[PDB]
């Protein structure tokens, strides 16, 4: 199929907002957006208790208003606060989602999806926590293409790098 393009990170981590800033727009719009490759984020959510929470209503926008995502993951890197704070509280997520100006129901949907115990949302969040491990991820953020690591991650070239072949 398609490249296959992978970011480990979480949301209260400073350098992978800045991978975000430095690398996503350009990404975005020369191979996500015209689905030239499949873009995955691995949130490993090892910041604090609101990590993980924070995880969830991630993977609730991805699965229910997937082209709405790389918005909700821009602007919440956006308002990273200090990493010692547990700022990923319920009423900022649920402040951001609104924010997307989804279709009510849609936005109703995910706030009560990323809240429920074992949703779907919930198990993904837990997954992503594994899928890094088992991958034997130590550093974050790092990205991968096809399992081949992206030299600088913070370089949108470097990603077009291992793209181009």
């Not at 490249?3 to 979480?10: A, H, M, T």
């Not at 991805?62 to 082209?67: C, G, H, T």
């Not at 308002?79 to 109703?108: G, P, R, S, Y």
Request: with cysteine; charged share 35%; hydrophobic share 30%.
């Amino acid at each position: 199929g398609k490249p296959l393009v992978v970011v480990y990170g979480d949301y209260k981590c400073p350098y992978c907002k800045e991978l975000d800033e430095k690398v996503m727009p350009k990404l975005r719009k020369n191979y996500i957006d015209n689905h030239k490759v499949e873009y995955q984020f691995v949130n490993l959510a090892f910041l604090g208790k609101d990590s993980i929470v924070g995880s969830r209503a991630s993977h609730a926008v991805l699965m229910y208003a997937p082209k709405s995502f790389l918005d909700f993951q821009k602007q919440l890197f956006a308002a990273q606060q200090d990493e010692n704070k547990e700022w990923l509280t319920k009423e900022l997520l649920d402040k951001h989602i609104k924010q997307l100006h989804l279709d009510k129901e849609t936005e109703n949907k995910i706030i009560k999806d990323y809240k429920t115990k074992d949703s779907k949302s919930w198990k993904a969040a837990e997954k992503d926590k594994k899928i890094a491990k088992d991958n034997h991820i130590k550093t974050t953020p790092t990205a991968f293409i096809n399992g081949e690591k992206v030299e600088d991650p913070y370089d949108y070239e470097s990603y077009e790098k291992l793209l181009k072949d």
